[PDB]
Amino acid sequence: ATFEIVNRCSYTVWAAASKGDAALDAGGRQLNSGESWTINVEPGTKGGKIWARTDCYFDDSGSGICKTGDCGGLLRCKRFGRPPTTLAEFSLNQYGKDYIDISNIKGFNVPMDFSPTTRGCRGVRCAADIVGQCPAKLKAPGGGCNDACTVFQTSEYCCTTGKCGPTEYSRFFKRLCPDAFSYVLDKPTTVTCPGSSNYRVTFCPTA
Numbered sequence: 001a002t003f004e005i006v007n008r009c010s011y012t013v014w015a016a017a018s019k020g021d022a023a024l025d026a027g028g029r030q031l032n033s034g035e036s037w038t039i040n041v042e043p044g045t046k047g048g049k050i051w052a053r054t055d056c057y058f059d060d061s062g063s064g065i066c067k068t069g070d071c072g073g074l075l076r077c078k079r080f081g082r083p084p085t086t087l088a089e090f091s092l093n094q095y096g097k098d099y100i101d102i103s104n105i106k107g108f109n110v111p112m113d114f115s116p117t118t119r120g121c122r123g124v125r126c127a128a129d130i131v132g133q134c135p136a137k138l139k140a141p142g143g144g145c146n147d148a149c150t151v152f153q154t155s156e157y158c159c160t161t162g163k164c165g166p167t168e169y170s171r172f173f174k175r176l177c178p179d180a181f182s183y184v185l186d187k188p189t190t191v192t193c194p195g196s197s198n199y200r201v202t203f204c205p206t207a
Contacts, residue, residue: 001041001092002198004117005050007031009204013052013110014066016077017041024048027076030056031203043093043196050088051081052110052203054143067142068109083107084144086126086180088114088201098193102126103181104173108134109144113205121193126177127206135172147173147183159184 005015012032017024017039025039041048051069058064062075069081084107090100101124102114108130115123134145148169149158156164166174170183179189 001043001045001098001196002117003039003041003050004198004200005031005037005039006200006202007033007035007052007204008202008207009033009052009110010207011054013054013203014056014058014069014075015050015203016053016069016071016081017048017050018071018077018080019045019048020080021078023076023078024050027078028053028071028074030075041090041092046091046094048090048092049080050090050114050201051085052112053081053085054109068140068144083150084109084140084146086110086112088112090199093195096195098195098197099190100124100193100199101181101188101190102177102179104130104177105147105149105181105184107138107140107144107146107150108173108177110203111205111207113200113202115200115202116193116197117200118194118197120197121191124179124189124191125205126180127204128176130173130176133172133176135169138169138172145173157183 053069055067071077
């Protein structure tokens with residue numbers, strides 16, 4: 001499957017793409033404002049994620065640090081990133097269908113649109129000013145708005161027992177972005193697409 005990753009933000013982002021135990025394609029790249037990066041993701045990939053990292057510094061060997069979404073200090077991510085990270089999530093060719101969603105379960109750093117470039121389904125977006133409206137306790141100094149599980153590490157926010165409910169914090173993400181997962185047991189906002197669809201992930205789709 002092909003994914004075109006577009007940075008429409010006025011600032012540079014370092015895109016990342018991983019399935020948790022391996023990079024997807026190159027795994028990461030710098031995207032200046034307006035740049036597009038096309039990646040190929042193997043059919044049948046389960047649990048893939050794409051996210052943006054902000055305020056990165058990398059040396060000649062691709063080692064460094066980002067203020068949001070750092071994946072063990074690598075430019076080319078092999079693992080998932082440190083919250084806060086708005087996430088584009090996908091599982092491809094699962095019994096003839098692709099499943100896509102946007103998640104705020106690991107917080108929010110950059111607004112995003114995740115849409116198919118092929119026919120058969122709709123896209124999802126979370127483009128509200130979550131960082132600007134972020135509750136004081138969830139604000140991340142490096143930038144972004146953390147989820148409550150990252151901040152407080154309780155069974156209720158992390159849904160550790162598999163029984164949790166919405167919270168004051170999850171309702172904040174849900175009010176601003178109804179089409180994104182706000183907590184582990186949220187009513188699914190997953191979109192089913194035809195198997196082998198192609199997609200575009202756009203950072204800052206409105207601004």
